[model samples]
Target: SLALSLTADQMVSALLDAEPPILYSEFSEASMMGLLTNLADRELVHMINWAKRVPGFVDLTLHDQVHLLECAWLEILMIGLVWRSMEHPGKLLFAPNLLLDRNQGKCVEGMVEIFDMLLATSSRFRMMNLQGEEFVCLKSIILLNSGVYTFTLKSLEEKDHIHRVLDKITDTLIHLMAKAGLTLQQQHQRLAQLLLILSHIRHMSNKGMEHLYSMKCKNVVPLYDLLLEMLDAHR
Candidate 1:
């Protein structure tokens, strides 16, 4: 049934699969930038494939689905990365195998700043003992609430319908958190902070886009069509 695709457990596996690790390593500025971008470049399709499987997501109009991903993909990528590195504060875990530290981050322009911004967010989640269920739910919410307005969605109905969908998943997150044994006051604040995490993500994404634009024009590595498509959206 379509129910299987909507489960947090299934989406977790798909996300993990989508993020296969790098087998080798290089720490130089040019080398790291090339590898990270190339790696991120390829992962977009995995997300596209994974997105289709996120249960309630299937309800969106076909055009709405496509438009949503075009803008939300990068931030969705960061959401996972932020979740993964929550436990360990030492290195940024781009993937299970692709590890980076502050020094490596400094190799690329503004990369270290973004690195800390992420880890700062991760640190908060780690303290809260954020779980996979919450993360997947959060990603789904972020996907639905994607703030890119350049999109010319055909009907106001699609937007309102998306809001309704967002409310449902958001309630799922609230319910999941409540099950963690939080008291009424504790759950209230935690949910507030959780919403704030999305803000941090957007801030990082903005700065990240600027750095990526700089990287794209300098020609350090060839931008794949998918990566270029996502990048070109902002420019």
Candidate 2:
């Protein structure tokens, strides 16, 4: 409803202007693991609030709403992780100032493998030169698709409603590029590439869940709040 009413610019700006909720000054007070968990909890807070703000999102049932966040928060966070780290190459940008390189002494439980995967995703985003509006579109798409296959649904009407919102989102992306002087053929391929990354992100999400499972079992990262609830996210 309201989602269809948002001008493309407004839709993009809703997510674009959402800053990470912490400052570098406050960061020094936390240990490495402390920073990781604390940032995660805070980020999840913004992520959930932002999701509800999405145009058609609030129209969904509250159960489905939380279900979507539970199912897709990892993918959303990693997409953000990749987007933030895209330009850095050698380090992951956990925030505006909190950049962490591989040699930074094991911040998370599965630091080596998970960090390596994050680093590689950054490289891909770098090569693509993913612009901010495109990233907003990608994040929206991921959150919308998370529940499409995960559980039994009440009816087809719910599915159709989501697809309509999905149509509006991609239409905004098309308009975004058209104004940038991208040709019809070029836009077609760009959208294809954008949608294609879903599989790769899902693969990364599985790897992330595997790590989170161990992180919980070992109590290495001190999972709490939304991070703990979303861990219940695993399929």
Candidate 3:
């Protein structure tokens, strides 16, 4: 309810501005790894703490709570990165100080796809002129989504309960869009496009995880313990 009550600017500033990505003209390999570890550590903590802040999230069973985090963490992280990149063009904002151009991402062991997805997602967000309220709502829906193949609901009611929350948030988002001057038809179209973008982010998350795993196996970059647990925990 409070989430829906946030003004557009407040929602954007709170959700997207909480952690602004740093822009680096250039960075070394060591610095890049440092940034990656820092982001992982920070985001993992934020991800759990954020769940607690969400209205009904902490009410879920421990199983469901962990499952939701496992499924949504990377998706949310990637979406945040895309949102940040939308502020600037032609570069991937991987961390507060680790911005990289299209070609530069290739120098790393496994960042090409990650960079590509971030750029593509940013392009889509820009094309839609997506707003902060919309992005936060989308992220909320993604967090509560029980559709992940890895997500197993304990019962039909549990699934329905999650969907009820989603429906409320979805309606709120639609109302916000209409208030922002979108027509009925425009709202419908925008909702569909945003859902598709979430699906795309899901695909990107899987690829991103695979890349992280590849790097892990090769020991290309050191990973923090929490980050490693997150990468392996979702199943």
Candidate 4:
């Protein structure tokens, strides 16, 4: 049976709990940089553990496992950003205490497009009626992609194993949608639409890295050493 052991809502709740959002009252250019760096560092670890929860993920070589995590790191971050603010339009809920608006005085420069992309992504998530289980599965799929050309897996068998797992999850997503009363065509369209969102996120992730690089150059604040390493790992 291709059934999920955890309910859609439970999985999402657990993820959020593991990296509970922080609260912040103010931000200078320096402070904002610090905030993001800290958040990224914490989430990176949490996401690795989250990945390990996926069946058979732990059996892969540590190098290949890390490669997948490195590839998906930014995408997962963007997804969290979108999910945190989906309920409130025009603002990003960075943490329970930190809400940000691009037009606000404290907003960072050179990040307008990043915020716009996030907002657009959130709207699409809402429009599609995406649930927690779907979000979790999609995040895993994003991590599995080695979009830059080579993945850590050295063998065709390992590659096939990953592909098969992803396919099963994809089927599960479609089946869940169908169970919700959508017609078969509608289910297929929904799956396609969700995957399309990943394309936009990929572009957004690239821009985000560029933005981070700019901040690093300015010495606004130091990025977490781990984050910098991951950014360079694929290259």
- TM-score for each predicted model, relative to the true structure: 0.85, 0.87, 0.84, 0.84
Residue by residue across 30-76, what tens digits does model 4's lDDT show?
A: 77778877777777766776777664465567887887777778887
Task: Tell me the whole-model lDDT of each prediction, alpha carbons only.
Answer: 0.72, 0.77, 0.73, 0.71
Those runs of model 2 whose alpha carbons end farther than 4 Å from true positions after fitting are 7-10, 14-32, 105-109, 151-154
What ranking of all candidate models by TM-score puts the best one first?
Answer: 2, 1, 4, 3
Poorest 10 consecutive residues by lDDT, candidate 1: 17-26
Error of 2 at 71 (Å): 0.7
Clashing residue pairs found in predicted model 1? none
- Preferred candidate (TM-score higher): 3 or 4: 4
Number of the top lDDT candidate: 2
RMSD of each: 3.6, 3.1, 3.9, 3.7
lDDT of candidate 2 over 171-228, digit per residue (tens): 8889888888889999998889788877889888898788767766765666576788
Worst 10 residues of 3 by lDDT: 17-26
Tens-digit lDDT track for model 1 on 129-181? 87877787778777778843434345566666666666656666677667788
Residue 186 in candidate 2 has what lDDT? 91
lDDT score of residue 53 within candidate 1 = 66
Error of 3 at 84 (Å): 1.2
lDDT of 1 at 231: 80
Q: How accurate is candidate 4 locally (lDDT)?
A: 0.71
- Which pairs, if any, clash in model 3? 22-96
